[PDB]
Design a protein around this ligand. Structure first.
Ligand SMILES: Nc1ncnc2c1ncn2[C@@H]1O[C@H](COP(=O)(O)OP(=O)(O)OP(=O)(O)O)[C@@H](O)[C@H]1O
Ligand SMILES: Nc1ncnc2c1ncn2[C@@H]1O[C@H](COP(=O)(O)OP(=O)(O)OP(=O)(O)O)[C@@H](O)[C@H]1O
Ligand SMILES: [Mg+2]
Ligand SMILES: [Mg+2]
Lengths: 50, 413, 223, 111, 411
């Protein structure tokens, strides 16, 4: 119950669509109602996300 | 008597016929297309550029004189000004993408050059005017005010010389001789629209006297006045008609005014979404700021539906110059134009051709001259014959145009 | 070592490799010659098992400037055994050497691996004839650029005169001031004046009747 | 092939570089001496298959006797391509241009 | 200068398929067993060579101090913006995605030559300054519309259309392969070609066969792909699609069923037809843009031609109009020759009899007959196909449309 209630108290994640984006640890994301962003990856995933 | 196929009956089909090479040829083709895939994700070559500079000149730039552009420098926006007030600013300003605001100027400026319709630097929080900026002079006008000689000869649009003579009297005679107007007691006309069939010489008679002006000339894209953002196209047509009235002896050519047109004095005009922003502002600045001007504006369209009688009320537009088809001698002149510049025979006659071109435009006449060359490419030729053109006229006019049923003729000879 | 392989050209017996390579058992800068007489006996056939030892032994290794000539000459022998299975492997050859070489390689690709196209065909067709100015209009001047301007020169190693004048005369125009005329003003016009050698007499391509060699190779391959 | 296309000297792929001099103002900026190596091939490559040249080799004959020892060998080597596949009078063409008693001239000519 | 900007510095990316279109036995023969296993050999080796390529690279890099700090000098969530105008004093005016316009600085490592109005840049969050210019990258909508695979078979697949095949090859393939002929007479090649006729005739086939045997970049756009609803998304894509076609190859743009994007230009004041019409107008404008088209060929194809805007049909824009009629009793012999090639034809059939009794069936009609007659042999449990299966296929497939004739009235 404590593990739920702390993760509840957390601003939720965005969702952005990538059909393809460039390599070298940075990808190119347009999100929902906005422009495109050159972002960085987290270190639990790959650059092979495309 | 229909019968369907039992499970043993399936095995009769699937076995018979090359049971040695059937799968042997097939799975090789199967896994190679799998292997076409497995190369592609294995390759994945794609890389970025991100537009950096060579580090010979930016390493000292990449010193603290980036942070001196980070924290001291600001992020001020740009807007427009509706108007002002007296003795105290109380300025009215639109972001127009955000709201319109009643704001102040900041202390770094003087209240003189904060005139109406000006780009200014606006604070992100307090929205104060920081720096007045120019209207981005001048790619909004001079990128279509090209002031460059076009490659159209006076002898290119021959055959319609009287329609040229109308336009030579309307345009050239006040711009270079406003003296017989004083010697007689008259004033020149200041409105001409062009309409008629497409491909008639509209842009040609425009560009031929744009070649023969030695002066300012402006061509206007019809869809350029159509904008994505509401309240943006009117702001452009403001800036066009202001900075074109500045210098003297200039010409503006409107073209494809179907998108910005329509009768607004008549039954319609139930529009009013960024087309009328352009339209109401141009008819505002067409009169009002033009008694006794110097810059003539010409319109041209393919649709005579979009005539505005408020434009055709005198003061804005006066004369209906339309273009027509050449009788014969205009056509025979045009065939000589589009065939002098190509590998022809020195013995063909062109009056025989314009007999076969009753109702045709110079766009079609040009198309025949190109098509007749294409027949010369079919065989090994390097010069065109008489019959090369004769097949072309049959291919163009006697095929898709308004005459068919050639074999049943036998009533006329 | 080249006249050795010219003295032992065209036999897939693999005794000539047992002859020559065991004869010059020596230091590796003399074992540069190991790849020569090996594959000079291997003019044209399907012996794809040789083509994998033509890759797998000296593939890349990153090789800080010691045997870089050998991987070029190992790639040089990949150029033949490709020019006469009659286009069965020529599509595969342009598929490999365009990808993992110039678009995925080093001193092997961006110095030398364009001499395939000056050796695979010389008819000319706009697949490879436009694939070379992908790497020529981009001169990549950081290297000793006459390596890529060597690939300029025998880009016009295609006979049977054509419309390729558009590519050459325009690159000669940018080749007058830039791509400096001290070094290759001979070369561009050597390339320019070679396509129109005569009007005629362009058949140097080792294929008579339908497919037989007629060497031929002994005169071309030295250059 | 004298019937189908060809008189003895086209010599004008060099002349096809005529439109360049108006491309961007003026011309006559190129004076590199190593270009004169390539000047041998306006005479060199086009004269294969009986492009025999008395005094059309004067661009050779001057530059043979001007400088460029390796170009002295090269312009002498171009004469064999001028008379290609020939046994009837090929050596007689060489002999008049042979006796200059030079290292580079005869080693190019006799090659 | 003479060679200003050296023409946009830009290459072309053509197709990568047609790996080996030589499978010419077309039957169960050991050659095709030998041919395809050769192709397996070269693809496995090209796999293993690039597998050894990312294997045997001992690099273990350490970044330069200038590059490592600038990557931390810039923000980590970089945002994509758009240039509008430029003031050269290291600060200019750009625009966001929503259009908010900012007097941001531009940093002095951006390679200050690529700055042209319309170029895409990268921005910060704090001061929104131009971190670095982005190369001319496009949205994923247009990158789907670029063809990767050569689809199908070559001109031997079609059943005799050679009067019209020789037309399109003059207009498309000849100016690319051999543009010597046109300069011999100073004639420019044609620009646009419209393919029209009754449906089921082979309009899509000739598009696929050209896209097979070509060296051009082939763009596939189908009609109502191009229509969206965000008030500017219509005319934006036309500019982006022909920018891609300009920067890449001497190229082929195939737009299919342009009747869904063009008809006679009515202008109701409701804001549903304008988005069609503004897009309709600008495509016709971007067609004759004339700035530098750089040999971009446009192929258009509909069924009906009468319901078109005459501003499209006029010369100056489109030069070739091509009819694909219901052919003859002669090229039908070739289509029945082609569509019956890969099947065990029994020696009782006279396929001329089917061509004899009928006059107005199409190529898609023939292919349906060939499949249905094969299904009838499976119903009565066979492999070879008698004459009777073609008799039953002709009766089953055809009688659904044939309505209306004055029999007895004429003779
Ligand atoms: N009267 C003419 N005299 C000479 N050439 C002509 C004439 N009419 C047409 N042409 C040919 O047609 C072309 C000119 O067409 P024009 O520019 O008039 O079309 P347009 O009126 O702009 O068409 P639209 O109104 O549909 O935009 C020229 O290239 C020219 O070769
Ligand atoms: N002349 C022909 N030769 C061979 N096959 C044909 C021919 N005409 C049509 N076909 C067959 O008909 C099928 C459909 O043809 P296609 O769709 O290209 O005609 P279309 O005119 O494009 O029809 P639509 O406009 O309705 O798409 C093709 O797959 C082809 O197999
Ligand atoms: Mg026009
Ligand atoms: Mg179709």
């Amino acid at each position: 119950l404590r593990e739920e209630l702390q993760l509840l108290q957390e601003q939720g994640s965005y969702v952005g669509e990538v059909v393809r984006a460039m390599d070298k640890k940075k990808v190119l994301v347009k999100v929902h109602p906005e422009g495109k962003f050159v972002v960085d990856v987290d270190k639990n995933i790959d650059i092979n996300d495309v | 008597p229909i019968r369907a196929l039992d499970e043993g009956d399936i095995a009769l089909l699937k076995t018979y016929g090359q049971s040695t090479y059937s799968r042997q040829i097939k799975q090789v083709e199967d896994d190679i297309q799998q292997l076409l895939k497995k190369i592609n994700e294995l390759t994945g070559i794609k890389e970025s550029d991100t537009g950096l500079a060579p580090p010979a000149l930016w390493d000292l730039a990449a010193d603290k004189q980036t942070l001196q552009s980070e924290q001291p420098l600001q992020v001020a926006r740009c807007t427009k000004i509706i108007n002002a007030d007296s003795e105290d600013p109380k300025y009215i300003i639109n972001v127009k993408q955000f709201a319109k605001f009643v704001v102040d100027l900041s202390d770094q400026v003087a209240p003189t050059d904060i005139e109406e319709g000006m780009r200014v630097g606006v604070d992100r929080n307090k929205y104060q005017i920081h720096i007045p900026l120019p209207p981005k002079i001048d790619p909004t006008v001079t990128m279509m005010q090209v002031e460059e000689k076009p490659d159209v000869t006076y002898s290119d649009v021959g055959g319609c010389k009287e329609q040229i003579e109308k336009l030579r009297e309307v345009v050239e005679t006040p711009l270079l001789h406003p003296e017989r107007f004083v010697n007689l007691g008259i004033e020149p006309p200041k409105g001409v629209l062009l309409f008629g069939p497409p491909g008639t010489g509209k842009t040609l008679c425009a560009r031929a006297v744009a070649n023969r002006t030695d002066a300012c000339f402006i061509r206007v894209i019809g869809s350029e006045l159509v904008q994505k953002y509401v309240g943006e196209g009117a702001r452009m047509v403001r800036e066009l008609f202001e900075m074109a009235r500045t210098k003297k002896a200039c010409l503006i050519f409107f073209d494809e005014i179907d998108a910005i047109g329509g009768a607004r004095f008549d039954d319609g005009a139930g529009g009013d979404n960024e087309v009328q922003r352009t339209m109401l502002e141009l008819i505002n600045q067409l009169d009002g700021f033009d008694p006794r001007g110097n810059i003539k504006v010409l319109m041209a369209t393919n649709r005579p539906d979009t005539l505005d009688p408020a434009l055709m009320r005198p003061g804005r537009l006066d004369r209906k110059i339309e273009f027509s088809l050449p009788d014969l001698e205009g056509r025979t002149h045009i065939f000589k134009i589009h065939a002098r510049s190509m590998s022809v025979e020195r013995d063909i006659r062109f009056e025989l051709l314009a007999r076969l071109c009753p109702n045709s435009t110079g766009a079609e006449i040009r198309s025949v001259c190109t098509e007749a060359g294409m027949f010369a490419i079919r065989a090994r030729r390097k010069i065109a014959t008489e019959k090369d053109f004769l097949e072309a006229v049959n291919k163009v006019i006697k095929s898709y145009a308004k005459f068919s049923a050639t074999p049943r003729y036998m009533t006329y000879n | 070592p080249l006249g050795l392989g010219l003295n032992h050209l065209g036999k897939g017996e693999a005794i000539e490799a047992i002859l020559a390579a065991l004869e010059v058992v020596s230091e590796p800068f003399r074992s540069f010659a190991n790849t020569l007489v090996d594959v000079c006996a291997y003019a044209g056939s399907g012996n794809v098992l040789k083509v994998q030892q033509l890759l797998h032994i000296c593939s890349e290794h990153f090789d800080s400037k010691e045997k870089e000539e050998d991987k070029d000459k190992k790639e040089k022998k990949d150029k033949d055994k490709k020019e006469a299975p009659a286009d069965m492997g020529a599509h595969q050859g342009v598929a490999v050497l365009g990808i993992a070489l110039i678009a995925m390689g080093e001193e092997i690709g961006a110095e030398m691996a364009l001499r395939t196209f000056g050796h695979l065909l010389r008819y000319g067709e706009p697949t490879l004839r436009r694939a070379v100015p992908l790497a020529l209009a981009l001169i990549s001047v950081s290297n000793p650029r006459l390596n890529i301007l060597d690939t300029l020169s025998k880009f016009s190693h295609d006979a049977d005169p054509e419309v390729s004048y558009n590519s050459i005369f325009a690159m000669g125009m940018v080749g007058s001031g830039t791509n400096n005329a001290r070094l290759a003003a001979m070369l561009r016009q050597l390339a320019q004046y070679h396509a129109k050698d005569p009007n005629n007499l362009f058949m140097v391509r080792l294929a008579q009747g339908l497919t037989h060699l007629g060497k031929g190779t002994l005169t071309l391959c030295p250059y | 092939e004298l019937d189908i296309m060809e008189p003895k000297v086209p010599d004008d792929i060099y002349k096809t570089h005529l439109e360049n001099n108006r491309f961007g103002g003026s011309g006559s900026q190129v004076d590199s001496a190593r270009m004169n190596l390539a000047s041998s091939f306006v005479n060199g490559f086009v004269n294969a298959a009986f492009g025999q040249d008395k005094l059309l080799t004067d661009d050779g004959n001057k530059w043979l006797y001007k400088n460029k020892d390796h170009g002295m060998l090269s312009a002498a080597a171009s004469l064999g391509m001028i008379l290609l596949w020939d046994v009837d009078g090929g050596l007689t063409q060489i002999d008049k241009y042979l006796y200059s008693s030079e290292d580079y001239i005869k080693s190019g000519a006799l090659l | 200068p003479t060679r200003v900007g050296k023409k946009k510095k830009k290459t072309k990316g053509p197709d990568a398929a047609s790996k080996l279109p030589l499978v010419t036995p077309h039957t169960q023969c050991r050659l095709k067993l030998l041919k395809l296993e050769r192709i397996k050999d070269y693809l496995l080796m090209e796999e293993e060579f690039i597998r050894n390529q990312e294997q045997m690279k001992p690099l273990e890099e350490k970044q330069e101090e200038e590059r490592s700090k600038v990557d931390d000098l810039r923000g980590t969530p970089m945002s994509v913006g758009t240039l509008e105008e430029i003031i050269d004093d290291n600060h200019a005016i750009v625009s966001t995605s929503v259009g908010s316009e900012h007097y941001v600085s531009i940093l002095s490592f951006v390679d200050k030559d690529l700055l042209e109005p319309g170029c895409s840049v990268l921005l910060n969050h704090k001061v929104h300054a131009v971190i670095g210019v982005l190369m001319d990258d496009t949205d994923p909508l247009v990158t789907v519309m670029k063809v990767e695979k050569a689809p199908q078979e070559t001109y031997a697949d079609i059943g005799g259309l050679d009067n019209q095949i020789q037309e399109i090859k003059e207009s498309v393939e000849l100016p690319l392969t051999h543009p010597e002929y046109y300069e011999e007479m100073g004639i420019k090649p044609p620009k646009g070609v419209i393919l029209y006729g009754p449906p089921g005739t082979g309009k899509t086939l000739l598009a696929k066969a050209v896209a097979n045997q070509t060296s051009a970049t082939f763009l596939r756009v189908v009609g109502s792909e191009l229509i969206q609803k965000y008030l500017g998304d219509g005319p934006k894509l036309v500019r982006e699609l022909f920018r891609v076609a300009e920067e890449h190859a001497p190229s082929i743009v195939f737009i299919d069923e342009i009747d869904a994007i063009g008809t006679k230009r009515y202008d109701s004041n409701s804001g549903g037809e304008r988005e069609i019409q503004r897009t309709m107008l600008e495509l016709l404008n971007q067609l004759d843009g004339f700035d530098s088209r750089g040999d971009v060929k446009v192929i258009m194809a509909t069924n009906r031609i009468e319901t078109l805007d005459p501003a499209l049909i006029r010369p100056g824009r489109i030069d070739r109009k091509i009819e694909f009629p219901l052919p003859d009793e002669k090229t039908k012999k070739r289509i029945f020759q082609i569509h019956t090639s890969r099947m065990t034809l029994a020696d009782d059939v006279t396929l001329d009899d089917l061509i004899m009794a009928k006059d107005d069936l199409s190529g898609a009609d023939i292919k349906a007959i060939c499949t249905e007659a094969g299904l009838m042999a499976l119903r009565e449990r066979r492999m070879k196909v008698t004459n009777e299966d073609f008799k039953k296929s002709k009766e089953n497939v055809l009688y659904k449309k044939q309505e209306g004739t004055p029999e007895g009235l004429y003779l």
